[PDB]
Amino acid sequence: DIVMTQSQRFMTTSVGDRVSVTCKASQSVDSNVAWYQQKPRQSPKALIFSASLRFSGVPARFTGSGSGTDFTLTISNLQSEDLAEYFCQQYNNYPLTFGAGTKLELKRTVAAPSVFIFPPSDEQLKSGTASVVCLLNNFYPREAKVQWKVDNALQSGNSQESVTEQDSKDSTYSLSSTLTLSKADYEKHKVYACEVTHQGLSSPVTKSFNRGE
């Protein structure tokens, strides 16, 4: 099978800039390459075929190039509506295969997260499990680290996180982390802390509560 490799999963860019997304095939696929745009909660839209030709309706600022193994989608004068994921496909042989995609995000100024911790509710504890939630709100860039400490002891393996897509209005991200414990374990500790490190913070920020207070 032919593997289509997109060398960067993520690219930061700005309105008005030129952006180039690359795609490399594991063996030659002549000019039988297509490009697609896809936004969150939408299906793909076709942009380019035969490596350099536009589908009808596609704006002229999208161009494509390459033949053999190395392909490029170039967006000139990037527009805000062009913020999306972009992925290639080869149709030179079977099976048809797709690149994994390159997602564009919009540069903005650094913004430190606003951090909040939430103890488990009394209702939940009746279930036998406790969830502790830490929210990091409206920060940029997307990179952030959240550590859980229970009675000051760093936790590992018992948390999961989830991150929103970049906000279309203010270009920030938000992130939740959930620590899962049994109720019996929850009740055996005093201090629950979420410790956050991010480029916008000169030192880590800790939010904490003592169980029961």
Partner: protein, 222 residues
């Protein structure tokens, strides 16, 4: 306007069967090659197969010939994917697409996609727990509150606040698959700290697969 309207899918047992449908409008369906593609969670798109206008050619990705039968009924402008002997790996979003056969197997129009989950587990509605605003919330500043939508199966849930009247400052996070095999997600909102004594905040949670509907009041704790 070209549209490919998908239907079918949902939650099926391993070894089960499921037929997806894709209805075409705004094109002369009987002149078009059609394709099926899928995306598993966290993965790239993967082609399943294609069928030509009169059904005399049907090509499949080789790893998948056993599990999938593609067919079409031109009089209905409809394309089908029959799935059989499915396993958990076949959990994915399934797309139909038309093929740009004037030049090649590029996909010029895409359906909206159909979610399929393969699992032995039963449907399960979520529990909804408050994420109560901190009592220390900055005096005259901004407070955060939310709802934890825990332990449902399959996807999806929806969350609104105050029956859709509250939208600013809302972040509803992507679901996470827990090690229990059940999903969970949180929805949060930031609001003025001064409003916690006056405004009521209610998260409206729906889980259509289990017919679960929860309107959970989120209050400061005492």
């Amino acid at each position: 306007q070209v549209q490919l309207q998908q239907s079918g899918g949902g939650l099926v047992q391993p070894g089960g069967s499921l037929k997806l449908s894709c209805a075409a409008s705004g094109i002369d369906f009987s002149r078009y090659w059609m394709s099926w593609v899928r995306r598993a969670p966290g993965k790239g798109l993967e082609w399943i197969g294609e069928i030509n206008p009169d059904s005399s050619t049907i090509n499949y990705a080789p790893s998948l010939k056993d599990k999938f039968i593609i067919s079409r009924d031109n009089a209905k402008n409809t394309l089908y994917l029959q799935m059989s002997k499915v396993r958990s790996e076949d959990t994915a979003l399934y797309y139909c697409a038309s093929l740009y056969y004037d030049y090649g197997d590029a996909m010029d129009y895409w359906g909206q996609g159909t979610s399929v989950t393969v699992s032995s587990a039963s449907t399960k509605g979520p529990s909804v727990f408050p994420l109560a605003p901190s009592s220390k919330s900055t005096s005259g500043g901004t407070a955060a509150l939310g709802c934890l939508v825990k332990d449902y199966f399959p996807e999806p849930v929806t969350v609104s606040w105050n029956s859709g009247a509250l939208t600013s400052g809302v972040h509803t996070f992507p679901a996470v698959l827990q090690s229990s095999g059940l999903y969970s997600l949180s929805s949060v909102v930031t609001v003025p700290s001064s409003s916690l004594g006056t405004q009521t905040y209610i998260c409206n949670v729906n889980h259509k697969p289990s017919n679960t509907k929860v309107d959970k009041r989120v209050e400061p704790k005492s």
